[PDB]
Structures are given as C-alpha cells and as structure tokens.
Amino acid sequence: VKCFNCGKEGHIARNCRA
Ligand SMILES: [Zn+2]
C-alpha cells in the first residue's frame, strides 16, 4: 500500500510510471 519508490498513493513500485 503506497509506492515503495516514489511515495505516491496509488500504485506499486515495480512498474511505477515515474
Ligand atoms: Zn510510483
């Protein structure tokens, strides 16, 4: 719950759109 990488409250890290 919440993006490991990027902080943002949405999506999982692994293929995050960052
Ligand atoms: Zn992210």
Swiss-Prot record:
It comes from the Viruses. A zinc finger (CCHC-type) spans 1-18. It is found in: Virion. Encapsulates and protects viral dimeric unspliced genomic RNA (gRNA). Binds these RNAs through its zinc fingers. Acts as a nucleic acid chaperone which is involved in rearangement of nucleic acid secondary structure during gRNA retrotranscription. Also facilitates template switch leading to recombination. As part of the polyprotein, participates in gRNA dimerization, packaging, tRNA incorporation and virion assembly. Interacts with host NUP98. This is Nucleocapsid protein p7. The lineage of its organism: Viruses, Riboviria, Pararnavirae, Artverviricota, Revtraviricetes. The chain holds residues 390 to 407 of 500 of the full protein.
